[PDB]
Amino acid sequence: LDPWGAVEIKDYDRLLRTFGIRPFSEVLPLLRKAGMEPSFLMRRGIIFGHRDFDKILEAKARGERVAVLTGFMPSGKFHFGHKLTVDQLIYLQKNGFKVFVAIADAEAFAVRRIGREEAVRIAVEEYIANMIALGLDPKDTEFYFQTNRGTPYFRLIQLFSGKVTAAEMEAIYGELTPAKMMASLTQAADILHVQLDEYGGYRHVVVPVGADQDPHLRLTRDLADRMAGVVELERPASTYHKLQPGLDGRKMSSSRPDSTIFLTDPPEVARNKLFRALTGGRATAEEQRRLGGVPEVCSVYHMDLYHLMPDDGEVKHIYTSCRLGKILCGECKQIAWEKLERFLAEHQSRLEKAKTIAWKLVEPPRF
Amino acid sequence: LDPWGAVEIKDYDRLLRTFGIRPFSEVLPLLRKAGMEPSFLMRRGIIFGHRDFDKILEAKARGERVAVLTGFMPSGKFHFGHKLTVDQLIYLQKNGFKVFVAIADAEAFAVRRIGREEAVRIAVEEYIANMIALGLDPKDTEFYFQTNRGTPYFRLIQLFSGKVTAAEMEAIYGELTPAKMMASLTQAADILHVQLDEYGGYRHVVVPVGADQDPHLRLTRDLADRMAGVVELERPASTYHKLQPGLDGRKMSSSRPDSTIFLTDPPEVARNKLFRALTGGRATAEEQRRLGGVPEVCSVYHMDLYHLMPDDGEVKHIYTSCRLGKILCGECKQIAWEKLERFLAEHQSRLEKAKTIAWKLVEPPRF
Numbered sequence A, B: 001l002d003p004w005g006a007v008e009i010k011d012y013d014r015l016l017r018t019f020g021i022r023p024f025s026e027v028l029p030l031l032r033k034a035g036m037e038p039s040f041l042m043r044r045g046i047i048f049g050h051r052d053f054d055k056i057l058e059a060k061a062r063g064e065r066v067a068v069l070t071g072f073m074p075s076g077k078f079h080f081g082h083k084l085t086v087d088q089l090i091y092l093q094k095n096g097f098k099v100f101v102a103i104a105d106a107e108a109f110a111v112r113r114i115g116r117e118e119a120v121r122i123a124v125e126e127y128i129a130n131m132i133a134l135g136l137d138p139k140d141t142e143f144y145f146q147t148n149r150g151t152p153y154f155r156l157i158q159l160f161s162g163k164v165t166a167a168e169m170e171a172i173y174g175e176l177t178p179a180k181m182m183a184s185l186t187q188a189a190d191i192l193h194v195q196l197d198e199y200g201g202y203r204h205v206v207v208p209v210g211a212d213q214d215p216h217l218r219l220t221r222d223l224a225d226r227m228a229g230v231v232e233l234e235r236p237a238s239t240y241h242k243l244q245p246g247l248d249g250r251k252m253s254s255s256r257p258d259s260t261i262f263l264t265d266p267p268e269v270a271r272n273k274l275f276r277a278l279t280g281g282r283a284t285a286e287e288q289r290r291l292g293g294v295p296e297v298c299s300v301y302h303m304d305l306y307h308l309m310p311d312d313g314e315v316k317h318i319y320t321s322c323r324l325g326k327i328l329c330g331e332c333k334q335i336a337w338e339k340l341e342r343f344l345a346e347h348q349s350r351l352e353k354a355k356t357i358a359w360k361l362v363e364p365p366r367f
């Protein structure tokens, strides 16, 4: 009777301990002392790990302003993979964190060959505007473009290039083009620059990521240590989330549009994508009733768990019912659909106004 | 009877034509139309080549403001190798060019492992202050640090990283560390950024260099062409000088201090370095009188030709006399010494005041 899936995380939390990644539960008491209750993603163990988030919460409890930072590639449409990250920002923002959102338009240009005008458009109208419509505060959130962030941020990138080898970078990202080399240093600057006085002096910063992104984060923490004597930087903290599988059971992508719901999908389009999702269902109505289903492998159940059913009781009932033989996939899908239809409609009603607001929250680069 | 050494330059001007480098003499008529008389380095064929300097002079003649740009590595002491470059800047500055001088402090840090505080010190008190004492105008010269030059300059570096391959860079500089990769893009930005409106909009820029520096300049001209559609850049022009050999007949270096006169050398120290220089002299006083000497291989004669004797007649007389058997190396050295002693004394009398002025011509970077 395992709705949260504790046994799926004990298996590799052993291996991640090698990199100093800890179970998230060890910060519960610090989370309390900081006056914070866990979010539902924390309760459900979707946020399963942390490194140094205790130090962040210690700073926060003695009254220091603390920050969270993440970046977005302005390519393709905003989807529920992206929403999971923003939802973790909004939680932290409501609990007092300064939020920084980097737009990776330099990487978009140099690595992905995305045009300047288009990167900027997509960043504002697809990324920033969807983030605002989700509930990220337009006033207090600091959005910026990698190509328009200013001298002190770029000076770190210049000085970092002396503190890492080609082999170190190769180990993380593969073949080392000038563009991928630049992107790797710029991403470390995205994390660390908020610690400079020019950007507000936020020494304690947490970055929410998947495990698969830890190698770059470790190179960033090395860069902080290697800058000692030049500029004093703290190693960034991190929280670790399990990635939501796409509706096909493969990785969630704007590329493979059928297995990702976009936040801008019209209701008929989203419903059909949802109804086509892979489930843990069985041969037939008949066989499902005797044995029940397998929520552990069902992308509908993961949509409920990660997004559509914040209420623990309600998503437990789905799990129980499916595991007891009480529910078929057709009805389970329409239940998830009704939650999604309401979410999309309220979100989309906010989006045209968010887009207007968005063009005023940033200075686009001149070229 | 060849004082200028025309036959030493016809030999490889053939090979450099492969790269579109032309004899400098082809710009003489443009130089006239621009209201300019050749400098002595041009007359002597020490400036032997150009690429696209005609386009610069065409812009200048129709009244456009034109620019020259070069960079200096703030490492070690300022020597007569550096003076040859500044002398070409001063000539162009007196003929109306805007001069830009880049300090390579990012490269100094990341590639050469030179500390921040020391790079900055050396740049101001050893490089900028010696340039001012030489006659570079403190008001109209634009000096800057790579690490403090601002957003639009750094954006080029970020966008350039998408337009060059690892193999292209490898071909120019060897093993491709993150630092050497960064330095190569930053050096192209040093040349091209002056064309942006933010730095004055100087589309027509000339860079004075040795032939050995042309591979990087060609990659810079490729980067200009490859940016079409993103930001419109003109291919930079260049003039080409023969390098002055050190007093030992090897390359002139702060590393091998005996074969370079530093502008700050006290008179006794410079005199001795000069008196130890390799000459084209012979076994003995006796054998020199019959045959004469060999100025073509004499580092004393090259000091006269590149610096100490601007007057064509006077340096011709040295050549003639040595080639006629009329002069021994001891007297030739003391003649060159008297010119150098006067030059050093007037230069050094200007230097303490130049250092004061220098700290006001730049904003040093904060870290």
Ligand code: SF4
Pocket (backbone or CB within 6 Å): A279, A280, A281, A293, A294, A295, A298, A299, A300, A301, A318, A322, A323, A327, A328, A329, A330, A332, A333
């Ligand atoms: S009944 Fe629901 S949770 Fe169970 S396998 Fe089907 S879609 Fe998934």
Ligand code: SF4
Pocket (backbone or CB within 6 Å): B279, B280, B281, B293, B294, B295, B298, B299, B300, B301, B318, B322, B323, B327, B328, B329, B330, B332, B333
């Ligand atoms: S006489 Fe002068 S120019 Fe001739 S070889 Fe000696 S030092 Fe050189």
